[PDB]
């Protein structure tokens, strides 16, 4: 029977059926709760909205992402998210559906453990499995070799794969992603006079970032240009009129990914972590990796990010290797696409964790090669 593919991630839950071509349901992974008291009796106001419902009721709620950096911190809201997904987004009894779950590399072991335990006790699925987001994103790209640079909303990791083999000693995870870019934009938007502090209007800032921001091919030139001219200013209308205008910020914000010092982090930029991950691999496979940089995740969707990425990593690499960057136009869903592809296989139909097996061996079965 059909299998489910629920890619949790931060910021965006995307679910659907195995074998399909795109996730059916996509909604923000948030849980809102009213913060005023409510006076109209008979309104039967529920006590906890979730998903697009909360995203619409933003004005009177307090939103809580239950996944901070790839890891689940509030298990009750995560259970609400899963329950809502199954029973309303897909409208399917999870009793007879093996489900595929994803998680970033180098996560707390207890994360996937408790995840499996909940999936088997609360929802009582027949089987399940936890996969690495980067492997799936490589599946979707029709490749079998190449570093994959997944950069979701909470975490950013590189995974070098060659001939279907992963080199775990070179997996480089970095905790800078879309949420931090949103916060940095909220900060630097003050110096124009705009102040967004509410968890509700963090979403407004996220929309501004998704629409206007872009990566500059050369930071200094773009800075000097925005100084001289005004051909970079663009306006934007807030949910109550009062249009705003942002200039330098448009490329100041996503520049962080290449200079984490802007937000006070010490690690190297994206290009540099990529190059390092390359250099940690064996010398014989570095050319293919140079040729097969893959990009997934919504944060890699800035206009111009691939070009700047190529320029930087070209500057770092020798001048005789060829640098390419595989940026499909739907890369935001490459993880879910790869998940559907893998779940549709039959050579995979014996890698699931059968509920009987888990009852026999406990949630420790996850780390066991019944992965």
């Amino acid at each position: 029977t059909t299998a489910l593919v629920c890619d949790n991630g931060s910021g965006l839950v995307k679910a659907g059926f195995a074998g399909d071509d795109a996730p059916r349901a996509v909604f923000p992974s948030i849980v809102g709760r009213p913060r005023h008291q409510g006076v109209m009796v008979g309104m039967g106001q529920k006590d906890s909205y979730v998903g697009d419902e909360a995203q619409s009721k933003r004005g009177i709620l307090t939103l809580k992402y239950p996944i901070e950096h790839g890891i689940i911190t509030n298990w009750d809201d995560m259970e609400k998210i899963w329950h809502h997904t199954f029973y309303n987004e897909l409208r399917v009894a999870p009793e007879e559906h093996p489900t595929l779950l994803t998680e970033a590399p180098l996560n707390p072991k207890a994360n996937r453990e408790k995840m499996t335990q909940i999936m088997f006790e609360t929802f009582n699925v027949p089987a399940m499995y936890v996969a690495i987001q980067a492997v799936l994103s490589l599946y979707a790209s029709g490749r079998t070799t190449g570093i994959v640079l997944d950069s979701g909303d909470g975490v950013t990791h590189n995974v070098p794969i060659y001939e279907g083999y992963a080199l775990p000693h070179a997996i480089m995870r970095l905790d800078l992603a879309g949420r931090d870019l949103t916060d940095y934009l909220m900060k630097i938007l003050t110096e124009r006079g705009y102040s967004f502090v509410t968890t509700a209007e963090r979403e407004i800032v996220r929309d501004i970032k998704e629409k206007l921001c872009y990566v500059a091919l050369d930071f200094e030139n773009e800075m000097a240009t925005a100084a001289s001219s005004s051909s970079l200013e663009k306006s934007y209308e807030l949910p109550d009129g009062q249009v705003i205008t942002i200039g330098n910020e448009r490329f100041r914000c996503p520049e962080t990914l290449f200079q984490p010092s802007f937000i006070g982090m010490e690690s190297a930029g994206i290009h540099e972590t990529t190059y390092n991950s390359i250099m940690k691999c064996d010398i014989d496979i570095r050319k293919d990796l140079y040729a097969n940089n893959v990009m997934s995740g919504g944060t890699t969707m800035y206009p111009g990010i691939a070009d700047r990425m190529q320029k930087e990593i070209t500057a770092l690499a020798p001048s005789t290797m060829k640098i390419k960057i595989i940026a499909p136009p739907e890369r935001k869903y490459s993880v879910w696409i790869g998940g559907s592809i893998l779940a549709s296989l039959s050579t995979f139909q014996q890698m699931w964790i059968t509920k009987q097996e888990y009852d026999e061996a406990g949630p420790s079965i996850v780390h066991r090669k019944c992965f």
């Binding site: 872009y214 091919l217 206009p303 111009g304 070009d307």
Partner: protein, 56 residues
Amino acid sequence: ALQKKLKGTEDEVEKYSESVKDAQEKLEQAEKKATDAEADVASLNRRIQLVEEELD
């Protein structure tokens, strides 16, 4: 006593390096403005479309 080909082919390599230098340099110089125009169209498409909906 057969070094003439050595000299000639060394100079061949030098001038070929010069030619690829110039060629690829102006090549990426072109693609910079190419992707510039790509951003131009990707922007003004959106702008024309939104002002068009405003007109509607």
